[PDB]
Amino acid sequence: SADLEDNWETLNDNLKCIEKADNAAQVKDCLTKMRAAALDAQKATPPKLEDKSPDSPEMKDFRHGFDILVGQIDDALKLANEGKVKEAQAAAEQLKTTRNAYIQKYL
């Protein structure tokens, strides 16, 4: 099993994976694992919001950050499927921006 902290580390390890990958098959596995961990983290309650109602604006913001992240991952997967390996890898910068601005502030 995995908790939010575990899934966060999986997400960040596979963000590094995307940046260091050498071919389409590799980036696809990195992006797949990031997407799986993102969906699992999205269902958690982050430490700063444990006193909030589950549908509070803050929890909606937390979850929307992952919806953005998952959309960016899917966009990068499409590029990787098209053989645009370098452009797929470039999504790492924007994934970090989403991660930092939406989710990190709740940990």
Q: Is the CB of residue 11 less than 8 Å from the CB of residue 72?
A: no
Query: Which ranges in the chain belong to alpha helices (H)?
Result: 4-20, 24-42, 57-81, 85-98
Q: How many C-beta atoms lie closer than 10 Å to residue 94's C-beta?
A: 14
How large is the C-alpha radius of gyration of the chain? 14
**Can you give the residue range of the structural domain that contains 53?**
1-107
Q: Which residues of 3-19 are buried (b: 16+ CB within 10 A; e: fewer)?
A: ebeebbebbeebbebbb
For this experimental structure, what is the resolution in angstroms?
Answer: 1.7
| 101/52 Cα distance (integer angstroms) | 19
Residue 99, token pair as written in the block:
């991660």
Q: How many C-beta atoms lie closer than 10 Å to residue 60's C-beta?
A: 11
Domain count, the chain: 1
User: Is residue 44 within a helix (H) or strand (E), and if so which, with residue range?
Assistant: none
| 80/34 Cα distance (integer angstroms) | 14
Task: Report the amino acid identity of residue 46.
Answer: P
Q: Is the CB of residue 25 less than 8 Å from the CB of residue 83?
A: no
Identify the experimental approach.
X-ray
| 42/67 Cα distance (integer angstroms) | 8
Residue 39, token pair as written in the block:
């969906």
Residue 21, token pair as written in the block:
């990958």
Cα within 13 Å of Cα(103), Cβ side? 26
Residue 24, token pair as written in the block:
């389409």
Q: Is the CB of residue 21 less than 8 Å from the CB of residue 89?
A: yes
